[PDB]
Write a protein that binds this ligand. Structure first.
Ligand SMILES: [Cl-]
Ligand SMILES: [Cl-]
Ligand SMILES: [Cl-]
Ligand SMILES: [Cl-]
Ligand SMILES: [Cl-]
Length: 299
């Protein structure tokens, strides 16, 4: 990584987000005027310290980011390192979270929802073609490049949990968001590209209903709901939903990863690519709107 002072080359500014051991700031490159997002990742530095990320996990995220180039995945521009942090200069994605943008609309049909879902599928299809599992797919990691344009472009971000799956599975404990992780993550079982497909099922469920399918009243209950595949198309939220949409979701929310729909099959599923007009017109049904997001946020 570049062992120089990032401040010699960039002006940094507004914080855009921060988790544990990472903060993301807006920045501008002095030599070009172009804007980026700078992600400062705290290194733990010593193996016995608990005050940061393993420099090896960082190395993994950077090596994956350097390989990927696709219009629905975030681009890596440059990497700096100082004694305390590794700093990723990333493509700036400023349009906000997809679901926040969708919460502003009065109405959304299934057909409209698939135009955004298809961009997610396209990005994940690229990743899985490279045998890369993202492992942290959830609404907050699905951003918009520009929310004003007629067809906004989706960017998948945050490759902090992403792994190359060269053996078909990896045996590592993944600490993801309970609502969105697959049962094999909850149960500390071997993990593959299939885990992303589960997360896509959860995102799609929310995309049509405004409700979270496995969200329980305690964190452990949510994890148990996931492990038991306990969800329902509650008629309060899925009254309008087409059978094709429910079939697409049903084929992703499957406990056995080997029986789950693949990214390739999901792109060929009739809900995504209708085979006749009867199928296509069933996607005129209502997806999520402004009132469904607020009906479930009321809990
Ligand atoms: Cl938000
Ligand atoms: Cl990270
Ligand atoms: Cl095992
Ligand atoms: Cl069901
Ligand atoms: Cl299959």
């Amino acid at each position: 990584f570049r062992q120089e002072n990032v401040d010699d080359y960039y002006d940094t500014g507004e914080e855009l987000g921060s988790g544990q051991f990472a903060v993301v700031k807006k920045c501008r490159e002095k030599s070009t005027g172009l804007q980026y997002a700078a992600k400062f990742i705290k290194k733990r530095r010593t193996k016995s310290s608990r005050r940061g990320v393993s420099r090896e996990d960082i190395e993994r995220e950077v090596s994956i980011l350097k390989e990927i180039q696709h219009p629905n995945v975030i681009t890596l521009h440059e990497v700096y390192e100082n004694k305390t942090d590794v700093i990723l200069i990333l493509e700036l994605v400023a349009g906000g979270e997809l679901f926040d943008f969708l919460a502003e609309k009065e109405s959304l049909t299934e057909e409209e929802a698939t135009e955004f879902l298809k961009q997610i599928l396209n990005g994940v299809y690229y990743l899985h073609s490279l045998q890369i599992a993202h492992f942290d797919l959830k609404p907050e990691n699905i951003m918009l490049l520009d929310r004003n344009v007629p067809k906004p472009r989706i960017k998948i971000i945050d490759f902090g949990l992403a792994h190359k799956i060269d053996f078909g599975n990896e045996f590592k404990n993944i600490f993801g968001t309970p609502e969105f992780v697959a049962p094999e993550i909850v149960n500390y079982e071997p993990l593959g590209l299939e885990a992303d497909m589960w997360s896509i099922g959860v995102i799609t469920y929310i995309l049509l209903s405004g409700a979270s399918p496995f969200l329980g009243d305690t964190k452990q209950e949510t994890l148990a709901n996931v492990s038991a595949v306990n969800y329902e198309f509650e008629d309060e939220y899925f009254s309008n939903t087409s059978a094709l949409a429910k079939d697409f979701i049903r084929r992703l929310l499957v406990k056995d990863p080997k029986k789950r729909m693949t990214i390739q099959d999901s792109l060929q599923h009739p809900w995504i690519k209708p085979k006749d007009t009867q199928q296509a017109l069933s996607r005129k049904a209502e997806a999520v709107n402004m009132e469904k997001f607020k009906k479930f946020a009321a809990r």
